[PDB]
Design a protein around this ligand. Sequence first.
Ligand code: ZN
Length: 184
Amino acid sequence: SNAMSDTLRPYKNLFPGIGQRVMIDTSSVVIGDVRLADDVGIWPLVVIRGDVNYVAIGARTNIQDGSVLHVTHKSSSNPHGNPLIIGEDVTVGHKVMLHGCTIGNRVLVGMGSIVLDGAIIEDDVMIGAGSLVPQHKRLESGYLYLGSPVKQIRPLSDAERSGLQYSANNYVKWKDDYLSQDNH
Ligand SMILES: [Zn+2]
């Protein structure tokens, strides 16, 4: 709002719920019903707005710089609305737009991509930079998708599959580097 300048902010009676060893950059804006599990890192200049619906982010997931995360409101034609559900060990790349979608575990969303409402990204998926995942699109586990709108390109190589976990692991280490700077 116009006077509220906190990093963590209310919407009506909703307020973020934060686990352990969570980094939320001071320059970022986290509003309302945003549930951040252990070891989540929210990098600079990110907005996560869980006002008209909730946002749930699983453990050891990074939301990289410049991303915006939002949701669709609840109404008669859509009583549930579209909340934003993100699993564990997920890498949300820089400048990603996530809106009302579901992302499983060990997914890398390439920088500059857009994922729209009702999309469902299964576990162990990579999305190339600059992609667009349309509303209600399901992305099958174990594949590379890229394009606007995305096409299924090929199965992930075994190295790429492992790389999904490596990315999440690296980002937990890196957020811990920043947190260690705070504690000193
Ligand atoms: Zn929106």
